[PDB]
UniProtKB/Swiss-Prot annotation, chain A:
<dbReference type="GO" id="GO:0014802">
    <property type="term" value="C:terminal cisterna"/>
</dbReference>
<dbReference type="Pfam" id="PF00254">
    <property type="entry name" value="FKBP_C"/>
</dbReference>
<feature type="domain" description="PPIase FKBP-type">
    <location>
        <begin position="19"/>
        <end position="107"/>
    </location>
</feature>
<comment type="similarity">
    <text>Belongs to the FKBP-type PPIase family. FKBP1 subfamily.</text>
</comment>
<dbReference type="GO" id="GO:1990425">
    <property type="term" value="C:ryanodine receptor complex"/>
</dbReference>
<keyword id="KW-0697">Rotamase</keyword>
<dbReference type="GO" id="GO:0010880">
    <property type="term" value="P:regulation of release of sequestered calcium ion into cytosol by sarcoplasmic reticulum"/>
</dbReference>
<comment type="subunit">
    <text>Interacts with TGFBR1; prevents TGFBR1 phosphorylation by TGFBR2 and stabilizes it in the inactive conformation. Interacts with ACVR1B and SMAD7. Identified in a complex composed of RYR1, PDE4D, PKA, FKBP1A and protein phosphatase 1 (PP1). Interacts directly with RYR2 and RYR3. Interacts directly with RYR1. Interacts with GLMN; rapamycin and FK506 abolish the interaction with GLMN in a dose dependent manner.</text>
</comment>
<keyword id="KW-0007">Acetylation</keyword>
Curated annotation (Swiss-Prot), chain B:
<comment type="function">
    <text>Cytosolic calcium-activated calcium channel that mediates the release of Ca(2+) from the sarcoplasmic reticulum into the cytosol and thereby plays a key role in triggering muscle contraction following depolarization of T-tubules. Repeated very high-level exercise increases the open probability of the channel and leads to Ca(2+) leaking into the cytoplasm. Can also mediate the release of Ca(2+) from intracellular stores in neurons, and may thereby promote prolonged Ca(2+) signaling in the brain. Required for normal embryonic development of muscle fibers and skeletal muscle.</text>
</comment>
<comment type="subunit">
    <text>Homotetramer. Can also form heterotetramers with RYR2. Identified in a complex composed of RYR1, PDE4D, PKA, FKBP1A and protein phosphatase 1 (PP1). Repeated very high-level exercise decreases interaction with PDE4D and protein phosphatase 1 (PP1). Interacts with CALM; CALM with bound calcium inhibits the RYR1 channel activity. Interacts with S100A1. Interacts with FKBP1A; this stabilizes the closed conformation of the channel. Interacts with CACNA1S; interaction with CACNA1S is important for activation of the RYR1 channel. Interacts with CACNB1.</text>
</comment>
<protein>
    <recommendedName>
        <fullName>Ryanodine receptor 1</fullName>
    </recommendedName>
</protein>
<comment type="similarity">
    <text>Belongs to the ryanodine receptor (TC 1.A.3.1) family. RYR1 subfamily.</text>
</comment>
Amino acid sequence: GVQVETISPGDGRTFPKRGQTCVVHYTGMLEDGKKFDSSRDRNKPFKFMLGKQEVIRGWEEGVAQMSVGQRAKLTISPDYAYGATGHPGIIPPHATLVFDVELLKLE
Amino acid sequence: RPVTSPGQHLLAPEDVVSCCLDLSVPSISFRINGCPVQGVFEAFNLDG
Amino acid sequence: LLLQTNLINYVTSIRPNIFVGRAEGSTQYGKWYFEVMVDEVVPFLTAQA
């Protein structure tokens, strides 16, 4: 599942609601410490609407608990994540995912 | 190694870190904004 | 197996000219205290934190 640990606090009052676009920066690492993704390298925030299922379950639930301005570390088990099939080339099977996610805003 | 402190956050402006060294134990301890940091380094080499 | 490439920020260390240690017969006091106050931090000046 999703484990959320606050790196930096947010406002604590605003939380994503269904049908609301979440704009984030993230850096993606495997539990061994290897980085496979970062929106900051592309310099473009990643936008996803909650409840569509664009992102994996781990992102859905973890960002649901986050707040504006909040930076958090999200640990997502394979079940939430791509799982046994994995993401070919990028992610091996049965890989736990660690994400450093900053929720810049909601729109 | 994660350590537990009240109001955990990555070092941010207006934050004061207090570092304490006791060569006798030997131990190194930290306080965050006057609040104890629940972790210590100990049993480390004293070669220098 | 293959060599990996990524961009990393440079890091530098600063110390005061205080050196304290323990030795038998030493002239040095064992217990020491100091503080550091953070005026400004930019979390992401680069992609790397």
